[PDB]
């Protein structure tokens, strides 16, 4: 299978210069056209740049040409996008995508990488346990929460017990307010699980190197 | 005119008719072999371009396609062998039959056919015409059929794959056909254009090299040198223009090929991108149709060669179709049995077909009985030799009827009659075999005892005993090894061994001494009693003892009777008897060191032309790699346009650089050849007459050295520097690039490049044909033809043609076998080097599939390595074929630098020596011995001596070739004698100046020779390094009594005269030779044969200017006519070189000696 | 520029019905090669888009035969037959035939289902947050349908607070339900001032707790 992963996206002040890298494995990188596509916060996709298989031809849309610049390193199997003179409207989620024979333009999309361009300063989150009053049970099941609050910028990772708990989880999308983000998550486990063995809320905020595992307690 | 096509294959049997049909089928198959390869290759590239799917089953499919390539390779191996072998065998066998029949037809020919048609033309037409026929019916026809088959297969495969793309190629395809046709027609050994340019200068060279002694005599070398230089510069100009246009043509061929690639790819990507064709389909179509269109032009020299062969076959077949009026191959005539000698001539009018307007004979009637020795007397011109030739039926008389013992010749056999008549001609010739064969040449079965009997009757056994190999001695050409007397006596024996019934001698004792002629005549009277006899000679010693003597006048036999009958008759015979009572040295670049800028530009352009092949390999690999990558239609469209434009630009660069390289090397080469011809010719002129004596280098070796050196040295200099440089650039860049791109595949392909290059060379050599075939063998065969055409006069008497044709055939039997084996060998080598390409395709792409599968290189890299190393080793083969040989060039350069640095005895540009201000005119020769350098064992002088004073008309009289013109050459510094002393007014000629002597005197040559210009520039050749006045031109003409024949011709002093004066008559050219020397006004004058061909009234008007100008200057006249000898001051008779008598004419007439016998020829 | 406009912006489809989206272009896209390039992409909630028909009426490897495309000139359409819950997201129509490549807006697909009621659960502010001077009460309204629900916080039985924060997950591909969270955030002092906190989903669904700590 084709694996494209991306890296290098972080907060930047307007007018700054960023550089994104996307490593590609599982196919012959030096044979395929590759593109960068971008998804805004209103969730409207927009093409950003395209580069051919040798590195000769590159195509940009009028909006972005001059400021952005795409390149590829065929020896390390890497795709780079250099960005300059950023704007607030260039804040979005960036995907690398690989071209398909029979002429379809984006066959294999990578995972996103989130790029924010604002004056807001980095702010580590505040993780809070959530348990029922005095450990009260709701029958044969227990629902536990975890609240992260007041962070910036958006990307934040939340798991339960390093990913062991995955079946009955409900993470809710982040809500921006006062240049700060708020996110929450719930888990549902049998009554014979949580009071017996404790459940840990793993939170990470790469922007601030924050990483906290908060155990839920009655 | 030319023969029909049905009459070219006239000597074709059932076996030769089968060879041609099967060679034609195999050539068709071989032809269709290549477009099928392009079809498989197009289909194969789709397996590699769609190989990787997001490589399984790539090596299986490349196994199948390796089987396809190897099957086509095997088919082409077998078919190409069959094609070449069978066509060369058909042509070989047919040419053999043609050679034999041609010579056999030349033998069965009327006498005088050779006078009409020169025998250098026969001997040269023989070999040239048979080679020119052979060329056209050989493998050129197989190649023609192969190329037509390639054309049709190409277009059928094209139209079946996709028609839209083939139609576009077909629209530009006639231009491709014309480009290729013009290229190959220009290419087919465009050497005759240079020969046509140099023809005129070679004519001047052959003129001056016919009369080297004459030109040296007048001393006018510089004038002829200016003429040669003018002709030479004209030829140089034509050559420069020819190089310009030939190279422009090659350049436009390449421009068109590359722009064709550009168009094919620009439209083929439109079709691929639209989805209609694939990339393999486009490769298939483009290459198939391009190759078909080029193969049509690869067959254009075949129609040329066939037209030339048709032309030459017309001449040969016409020679073999004519049947003469007399021929020894017809048995119709009756053979008599009871042989009795009886001659009957009556009313015999006959004329020579050569000059039929003149009638020498006006009827002769004669009846001669058995044994009657009949002698015929008369001056030279009545036709005694004509009667001798009339006897053997060399001709037929126009009026009357001739008979021999009752019945006429005209109903009886020519062979039987010819064998029984032993005849000896005036000047015999002897065959260059052993003397035993020579005497055996009388008849078939003669044993050595009869040989000894006949040679002892000829009294020619002494010189047989003194010389080694007494029966094994190979006599030289034309009897040069032995002496004249021995030769004539053994010729008598050769006539006698036939045991004749009628004997006919003609001048049997021309140069014979007393006792040998006596014993010969005694033997002749020992074998005359059973045979009729007719003897013709000048000596009246062997005439007085005959039976009946007769006398010719105006061809008519006027006097008849015995001795005393003509004594009492008191006629002309009475008057006659009343009066009678290693190394090789390299300096070839120094020769061309003056033209350095042309070489700088040329080597630069050659580097670029070598680099043009790897650049194409790279561009081609990249275009095919545009469609093996996963890119969008815009990327593919832009990159395809970029690379099509690069094809076009490479085309333009190729046009310019080909033009320039060809033009600059051609200009340098032509400057070099002009300078070389000039320097060599000036050096030849500066060599004395003693160097020219050598029979190797007298006439032909020097002109062939001029027209060979010209080509050869430019070959060495230009070939070396251009071909080594172009091929180094080409292959070096190809191999380096293909090593950095893939080294395993490169090492595999590096073992196959020798065979691809040599395959190119063998093919191109097949296209040029064969320059020389069985050289040694052709010599062995043609020596017989030479000696049989030269001795024709003798051999028609001897009637030994059959026994000569058999010798020819036997001499042919070795080159025949040799040629059939050579065909079976050449077929194999050609077929193998042709199949090697298909096997190389198969091997390379199987290895390539292996590498691509293990991901050790890309497809584009396999394609680049293949194209640079294999598509670009064919170009090495072509380039290396086109270059002229270096070995022949280097040996030619060795010979040229030998002749150039050659140093002769005396220098012509040397004024050093004794230069006295005054002279006296007295000459004195004493004890002067001269031996020819060519003949060092035979002395022609024995220490002669002389004394000459002012105004002394000194006459020299003797036999022919006894040291008459020797004293001339011994004065004019042609030869310097080994011993002797020559005082010229007390001044030895060896210490004087060499040009002064040749400037003071002036002579007339033995034979007058004039130059290719008007008569004005004939007489104004006599005085050079000086402004010639026309008042002396008309004065000398009036004095020589030629002014009338000049003032009569239109454009009197600008009438262009032929070579040697072939337009005007012998008397006039003898007069204008007298006027040519008259302008010299010499203080010492010589005349050799001043009245050879002149009238009797013209001699008095020639001598009257001499008699008035004899005073003051020493005069020396050598002639045979006594008229100028009676009035001379002193006379010197010679005998084998020795001065016998000298003094005043009266003192020689008082004491009767040998000179008295000289005066006793025809006076009274 | 050529801009694509998709006719329905939201599309509700019963499970088993047929769903037809259409993407009318503006410049009648057709390349110079005579091919017209028009692809459809599907983004399922929380994943990267995925290819669906790389031209008019082709199908990508792995894509069921329910998806079919068909279009001509300047009007193109996509039809799905027998929708399932797995096929649930935003459908974009990309066109790469002209020199700026443009996507469409999108058409959210929503599968209908039997109205369920939330498992509501309320959570009291943690000790850690109270120490820093803050109090946030959190109430999850899990696995309900349809989306439209109202939550009303009651402090001390009467104080209908309004300073809350709400956030909806997207429709779950497994059970087609929704969820959402209601977070009531105030000061530690304004919280301590009261005892009973009630969460009410809207016969409403109530949940509540009584203390500042237990
Ligand atoms: C009987 C002997 C033999 O058949 C001769 C000769 C070589 N053989 C192998 C068969 C062959 C030929 N082409 C092939 C293409 C693919 C696969 C096999 C072959 C060729 C032929 O066409 O015969 C009908 C030929 C080829 C080239 C050649 C002159 C030449 O002979 C006429 N070139 C000299 O420089 C090159 C080229 O530029 C040219 O022709 O210029 C004079 C030539 O372009 C054209 C229009 O041909 C081309 C392209 C085909 C360009 C680059 C290199 N490739 C390699 C050489 C060359 C070719 C046949 C065996
Ligand atoms: C015309 C004379 C001199 C030569 C005869 C031409 C031969 C070689 C021709 C006759 C019929 C031709 C074939 C006709 C049908 C096809 C099928 C197609 O899918 C590939 C080409 C192919 C395979 C052609 C190849 C060339 C071919 C075999
Ligand atoms: C040797 C000469 C006279 C051949 C005649 C030239 C022909 C072959 C040339 C002239 C104009 C060309 C045509 C012009 C228009 C088109 C229409 C298209 O749908 C296919 C190609 C096609 C059909 C071209 C094919 C080649 C063509 C027909
Ligand atoms: C006479 C030689 C040297 C050149 C002749 C060139 C002619 C035959 C070639 C050159 C360019 C070619 C055209 C290239 C472009 C097109 C457009 C295509 O969609 C139809 C075919 C058509 C119309 C081709 C027809 C044939 C064409 C006109
Ligand atoms: C004399 C004949 C055989 C030559 C035919 C003319 C060739 C040289 C001409 C015909 C059409 C031309 C092409 C027409 C259009 C373009 C697009 C441009 O962006 C690159 C050059 C390119 C690709 C041209 C290359 C040269 C070309 C192929
Ligand atoms: C670094 C290396 C591998 C560069 C490769 C150079 C090779 C390809 C060069 C070097 C010497 C060259 C050869 C030198 C001499 C001649 C002899 C002549 O009769 C034909 C050309 C020929 C045969 C040249 C062909 C090209 C050649 C073989
Ligand atoms: C190992 C590397 C350098 C391989 C280079 C290939 C060499 C060995 C090959 C390439 C081309 C070949 C030459 C091609 C043509 C000629 C001309 C002929 O009249 C003599 C053989 C000669 C001179 C060949 C000799 C071998 C040769 C020089
Ligand atoms: C005339 C002489 C030099 C014969 C050379 C023939 C070569 C070129 C031919 C002969 C038979 C061919 C082989 C036939 C069978 C196979 C087996 C397969 O697993 C690999 C390809 C391979 C190995 C072919 C490659 C080319 C091959 C080896
Ligand atoms: C070029 C001509 C004259 C003969 C050369 C034949 C070469 C190219 C052929 C002969 C032997 C062949 C090999 C035969 C079998 C194997 C084994 C395996 O590992 C796959 C490829 C490989 C290695 C083949 C590659 C092609 C090969 C190397």
Tab-separated table of C-alpha atoms in Angstrom, chain B residues 328-450:
chain	number	residue	atom	x	y	z
B	328	UNK	CA	39.512	-21.146	-90.242
B	329	UNK	CA	36.517	-22.398	-88.252
B	330	UNK	CA	34.576	-23.370	-91.378
B	331	UNK	CA	35.202	-26.807	-92.883
B	332	UNK	CA	33.098	-26.243	-96.021
B	333	UNK	CA	36.122	-26.047	-98.305
B	334	UNK	CA	37.467	-29.149	-100.018
B	335	UNK	CA	40.862	-30.577	-99.037
B	336	UNK	CA	43.104	-31.799	-101.883
B	337	UNK	CA	45.087	-35.027	-101.657
B	338	UNK	CA	47.731	-35.298	-104.407
B	339	UNK	CA	49.642	-32.142	-103.552
B	340	UNK	CA	51.354	-30.527	-106.545
B	341	UNK	CA	52.892	-27.063	-106.619
B	342	UNK	CA	51.256	-24.842	-109.234
B	343	UNK	CA	50.384	-21.142	-108.981
B	344	UNK	CA	47.846	-19.393	-111.234
B	345	UNK	CA	46.982	-15.708	-110.894
B	346	UNK	CA	44.970	-13.882	-113.550
B	347	UNK	CA	43.441	-10.390	-113.544
B	348	UNK	CA	44.021	-9.916	-109.811
B	349	UNK	CA	42.785	-6.489	-108.693
B	350	UNK	CA	42.844	-5.926	-104.935
B	351	UNK	CA	42.749	-2.952	-102.570
B	352	UNK	CA	43.220	-2.597	-98.834
B	353	UNK	CA	39.918	-1.998	-96.994
B	354	UNK	CA	41.904	0.267	-94.648
B	355	UNK	CA	42.468	2.776	-97.493
B	356	UNK	CA	40.250	1.679	-100.380
B	357	UNK	CA	40.347	4.972	-102.301
B	358	UNK	CA	43.908	4.145	-103.388
B	359	UNK	CA	44.531	1.192	-105.717
B	360	UNK	CA	48.042	-0.245	-105.473
B	361	UNK	CA	47.295	-3.231	-107.728
B	362	UNK	CA	45.873	-3.101	-111.259
B	363	UNK	CA	45.963	-6.761	-112.252
B	364	UNK	CA	48.803	-9.289	-112.163
B	365	UNK	CA	48.897	-12.503	-114.198
B	366	UNK	CA	51.364	-15.272	-113.408
B	367	UNK	CA	51.801	-19.027	-113.820
B	368	UNK	CA	54.486	-20.697	-111.703
B	369	UNK	CA	55.400	-24.378	-111.882
B	370	UNK	CA	56.684	-26.764	-109.231
B	371	UNK	CA	60.086	-25.986	-107.752
B	372	UNK	CA	60.457	-22.859	-109.910
B	373	UNK	CA	62.271	-20.373	-107.689
B	374	UNK	CA	60.571	-17.093	-108.621
B	375	UNK	CA	62.145	-13.861	-107.404
B	376	UNK	CA	60.428	-10.473	-107.580
B	377	UNK	CA	62.407	-7.228	-107.741
B	378	UNK	CA	61.217	-3.666	-107.324
B	379	UNK	CA	61.242	-0.655	-105.066
B	380	UNK	CA	59.371	-0.501	-101.761
B	381	UNK	CA	55.789	0.500	-102.543
B	382	UNK	CA	54.805	-1.864	-105.347
B	383	UNK	CA	53.529	-4.440	-102.865
B	384	UNK	CA	55.713	-7.534	-102.647
B	385	UNK	CA	54.459	-7.984	-99.090
B	386	UNK	CA	51.014	-7.337	-100.562
B	387	UNK	CA	51.462	-10.313	-102.896
B	388	UNK	CA	52.731	-12.466	-100.021
B	389	UNK	CA	49.664	-11.585	-97.942
B	390	UNK	CA	47.428	-12.097	-100.988
B	391	UNK	CA	48.799	-15.619	-101.337
B	392	UNK	CA	47.792	-17.150	-97.985
B	393	UNK	CA	44.247	-15.813	-98.445
B	394	UNK	CA	44.602	-13.166	-95.795
B	395	UNK	CA	42.149	-11.289	-98.030
B	396	UNK	CA	40.233	-11.907	-101.229
B	397	UNK	CA	40.996	-10.244	-104.577
B	398	UNK	CA	38.294	-7.927	-105.882
B	399	UNK	CA	38.691	-8.909	-109.552
B	400	UNK	CA	39.617	-12.160	-111.231
B	401	UNK	CA	40.122	-15.648	-109.880
B	402	UNK	CA	43.169	-17.267	-108.293
B	403	UNK	CA	43.958	-20.964	-108.311
B	404	UNK	CA	46.558	-23.436	-107.086
B	405	UNK	CA	46.925	-26.505	-109.337
B	406	UNK	CA	43.697	-26.291	-111.288
B	407	UNK	CA	40.866	-25.422	-108.927
B	408	UNK	CA	40.387	-22.049	-107.283
B	409	UNK	CA	40.875	-21.247	-103.605
B	410	UNK	CA	37.336	-19.886	-103.284
B	411	UNK	CA	35.817	-23.376	-103.017
B	412	UNK	CA	38.441	-25.162	-100.889
B	413	UNK	CA	39.450	-25.156	-97.237
B	414	UNK	CA	41.311	-22.248	-95.658
B	415	UNK	CA	42.896	-24.223	-92.813
B	416	UNK	CA	44.269	-27.032	-94.972
B	417	UNK	CA	45.631	-24.533	-97.497
B	418	UNK	CA	47.126	-22.387	-94.742
B	419	UNK	CA	49.080	-25.195	-93.119
B	420	UNK	CA	50.897	-26.396	-96.259
B	421	UNK	CA	52.421	-23.007	-97.136
B	422	UNK	CA	55.501	-22.217	-95.073
B	423	UNK	CA	55.822	-18.430	-95.098
B	424	UNK	CA	58.307	-16.113	-93.395
B	425	UNK	CA	57.385	-12.443	-93.123
B	426	UNK	CA	59.581	-9.340	-93.210
B	427	UNK	CA	59.882	-8.898	-89.431
B	428	UNK	CA	59.161	-12.106	-87.492
B	429	UNK	CA	57.928	-12.154	-83.920
B	430	UNK	CA	58.722	-14.881	-81.412
B	431	UNK	CA	56.523	-16.189	-78.614
B	432	UNK	CA	57.764	-15.723	-75.054
B	433	UNK	CA	57.984	-19.434	-74.321
B	434	UNK	CA	60.945	-21.774	-74.251
B	435	UNK	CA	62.715	-22.102	-77.582
B	436	UNK	CA	61.716	-25.767	-77.764
B	437	UNK	CA	58.070	-24.692	-77.843
B	438	UNK	CA	58.959	-21.982	-80.365
B	439	UNK	CA	60.363	-24.492	-82.842
B	440	UNK	CA	57.560	-26.908	-81.923
B	441	UNK	CA	55.043	-24.242	-82.980
B	442	UNK	CA	55.244	-25.539	-86.530
B	443	UNK	CA	52.912	-28.483	-85.976
B	444	UNK	CA	51.691	-30.769	-83.209
B	445	UNK	CA	53.751	-33.976	-83.321
B	446	UNK	CA	57.427	-33.102	-83.716
B	447	UNK	CA	60.107	-34.986	-81.799
B	448	UNK	CA	63.520	-33.721	-80.741
B	449	UNK	CA	65.328	-35.549	-83.562
B	450	UNK	CA	63.392	-33.629	-86.204
